[PDB]
Subunit: 312 residues, 4 copies
């Protein structure tokens, strides 16, 4: 039986010793122990909190008493945390992040079976080397590109590229493998990362002005994620500010709020080569912010950052 | 005999000269009597509130003409969904209004704009379109202009609703499967005739480690309402809540939307105490649609309870 | 003052148990309705008969005619829930709410879906916004039309989908509507369970590579009055099958072209087959099992293929 | 430039030299020649057509001067041909199957760009080793589990497990890899198959009887795909007939007409171990028919068939 550690951080899914005893079936599939890393509403997570989790995961992944890791998380920023760990945890021990749409007290609460599934997946040989996984709604989803896409409903977490597998009666069924760099094959490592650069997001829409972009740069943004309309499109009213910001050294990364499929193509809506800007590829704005913040611990070259947005 | 449809051109990839747009689809003559006006020529990502008003006012003039049976607007994809929702709210006409764009220019291999334009004119000329509110006719679908959104990049199936298409248009014929449930057009309390300016409304994104910086800056630079594009069920970071309380007391409306746009909606009092803070939830409306509804609504009211009702009815 | 809701139990994984145990399992039902139960049958829905549908339809009609009933819930196996819901949508001439509900997991399983699905079914059945909307299905916090919801995803609780989207959602017992039905149903239907004592025999044959006329001929030989063709693509028919279907039509068997292309679009008349020349019918957007229900009900009234096609275009 | 061969089989997309003439941009990206292998409406395809195509593909894959192959195909059984090839073609040269939803004479016809993208993917080194691919609507879809899911519209082809990539301006962007056995790692080879076993499909629905199942076996079926309700469920009126056919040597494979996601679970709805039946896992009835025909060229052991249905 695999040794699995549950790291509790908070969220609608939640005292971690109670949490575990509340699912006695876990003892059947793994030797489980729990730790409370933090106790937060995930919409209120800070970069300090994400680093603390990254570090504690890394200490446990190096432990020989540890075969797999489950992180219980609020839904709101689950996808951010999952992508972060996918970039910085250089381990091929399974890492699973899991949450719930309903509290354990509610009628037909989803957390119990989610937590069982997460433990089952974290204890499975098939999970090794696959990168960070999310196990809600009987699905095995990639930590890279899974997002909270539907509110209220238990099927909240979706990817444009589909689920990789399913978990049913504690067994894993795989249909797809990841194509993007992660974990063991990442050039980033939480062991060398003690801090993260400031990165912020501004939204594009009808009649948008340069105000948010300038303010976020004035208050410390080292990169801005542009959550554009369409294919990362930028208002003629905002282009001149982004050019001035890039000249002051702020990276300009074009994402979009067009999140169900496709990607943002370099040089299509804007002259990225000429302006020395970066396209976020298929990554939504929150995900683009996590990859930018991790990438900028290593490089400030816009051409290297574009390679990173195309490989991870 | 044939319906009189006017095509109002605003720009976009579908035109990437209204007379050549129309010459480029000879078959339009089989299905309608068509004429074109260039209202403007823009990239829709650059659209302004003055452009919306100008368009809205032109549409209303044509809707009031006995020589106009239906109206097609050709438009860039990027903010098409915003224009369509705006018109659905302010045009008090049962006459069809159809908004249409394309994902490829007319010169591209397998360009989508010719059939999209034929289908928009067919829908604008069809009796079944009357009273339905504003429609968008891309990818053979009849989508509601209220809740269709550009949800897929690059592909021709770019426009999707959480509540499904209402119908399809094939070989110029409309096939209906659903009807609108929300207030629109003829049953709207809003009227472009009585709107001479729109209040400034801005949007700020919610994410891990977000600060109150954009919220304050946008308010300092004139926003009368802020659309919070929150994580999850419109959730607000405990770091930002005090700023949004101070802004609401300063008179700025706080509307909780989300970046969780494929289905569900934001529930009042669930993630934040809205009643206690005098905030509004945007229900199912994504941030850019919540901005349009806030802007139109605040031409008539600043009562947060009336705003909430309006977000539950439109 | 609470609404009177009756639960008609028929079996399924939601009861994996008497109706009295289903009601006892959700003690919060007492807060939103005066609930009563009746065990109509205890079956696996994959095993349902036409006699079971008729029986359930007549129980629904008597309860809908009762001044002491405000709404009706049917608990049902998932497998043919979509078939029961569409059948009731065609033959029940009541504006009273009729809700069909099931579960993917039994009540003793971890994170079982049944309790909340049954709470929400009763909530919707009790709500005045549900009146006049036709038969509803309330799973996964959704209000789905009984006309065109189908079991589309195995295992997961989001099993039930419509090509035309959910019509609303049910959250904390409250109903939130975003679309209305367009097609004819219930109070504006030309069909009535009160005038139906038997259902014509209707069967389904599948289209695929190398398919032959075998299944079509055997089903007609063993009494089918109509064959639903589950075609490839736009209800396409193999050149190896067309001759047999011409002969079956010539001999009185209606030929209805549906498809196994079930996530969107519909089957277009005269596009893949000359339906006018052949006197055949297209099933529009209806999947094969739904088309069989509509065909069955329609042929209680007409054997005229142009009336059948009008029906497939209006319901 | 890669040498790509286009094999025309018919369909709405379409003689092959006018097909190629129709897309003059093709010469820019590969050296293309056509052959007309057949001219059929794909709804009327036979087992002999599949074998003739599969053999012609295998000869071209062996040739030194062929870098990749495109098949132009009617949409109706495109998903059956694509899967068949994925199972029997032992090459890691790209094979791409492509059709169109509208004829080339129609307003906004999809066939020109679909044919361009197919040739582009067929000429890309990224396509080697990936299995058979389908390239419509700008997507790279797996031949294994892509299915005609939407009528009329150009987004007709979908997979429960999502697109593996996209093709844009002739360039391939990958996000997922296949997990199931295909082409070079398949235990099947078209070189050894002279004719396929007869396999038929019967539909499950309310008030279904054993008639179709009986008539198909009486007329030569060696396996029956049951297109069940739900999780491959079987009516109590049908089970006895299927026990009797299994006893007389006919394989019984439980598929479903629940085709948007999930799969059919062994022993859940029916006692497959006791009955010596097989479940089709996630494969839809027409795909499970292809796999049953191929598997049965090799084995008649139901435990080996179940293994095959779990690995392919
Ligand atoms: N406050 C939200 C609760 C959402 C959830 O976990 O369902 C969080 O921790 O993200
Ligand atoms: N610049 C974009 C082009 C997008 C399009 O129309 O496809 C616009 O006008 O919205
Ligand atoms: N035997 C199946 C059980 C499936 C379920 O209800 O989830 C039926 O009754 O339809
Ligand atoms: N009869 C169909 C035509 C449909 C199409 O290819 O779009 C075929 O050859 O499969």
């Amino acid at each position: 039986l695999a040794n699995v550690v549950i790291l509790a951080t908070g969220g609608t899914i939640a005292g971690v010793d109670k949490l575990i005893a509340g699912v006695p079936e876990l003892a059947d599939i793994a030797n489980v122990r729990g730790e409370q890393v933090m106790q937060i509403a995930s919409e209120s997570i800070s970069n300090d909190d994400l680093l603390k989790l990254g570090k504690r995961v890394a200490e446990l992944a190096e432990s020989k008493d540890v075969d797999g890791i489950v992180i219980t998380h609020g839904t709101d920023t689950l996808e951010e945390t999952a992508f972060f760990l996918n970039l910085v945890e250089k381990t091929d021990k399974p890492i699973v992040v899991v949450g719930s749409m309903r509290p354990g007290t509610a009628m037909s609460a989803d957390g119990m079976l989610n937590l069982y599934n997460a433990v089952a997946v974290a204890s499975d040989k098939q999970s090794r080397g696959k990168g960070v996984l999310v196990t809600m709604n009987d699905e095995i989803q990639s930590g890279r590109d899974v997002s909270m896409a539907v509110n209220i409903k238990t099927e909240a977490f979706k990817s444009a590229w589909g689920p990789m597998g399913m978990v049913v009666e504690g067994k894993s069924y795989w249909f797809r493998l990841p194509a993007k760099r992660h974990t063991v094959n990442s050039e980033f490592d939480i062991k060398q990362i003690s801090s993260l650069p400031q990165v912020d997001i501004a939204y594009g829409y009808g009649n948008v002005t340069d105000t948010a972009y300038k303010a976020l740069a004035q208050n410390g943004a080292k990169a801005l994620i542009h959550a554009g309309t369409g294919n990362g499109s930028v208002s003629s009213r905002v282009v001149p500010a982004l050019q001035e910001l890039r000249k002051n050294g702020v990276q300009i990364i074009r994402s979009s709020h067009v999140n169900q499929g496709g990607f943002v193509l370099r040089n299509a809506e804007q002259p990225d080569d000429k302006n020395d800007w970066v396209v976020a590829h298929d990554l939504n704005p929150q995900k683009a912010r996590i990859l930018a913040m991790v990438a900028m611990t290593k490089t400030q070259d816009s051409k290297e950052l574009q390679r990173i947005f195309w490989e991870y």
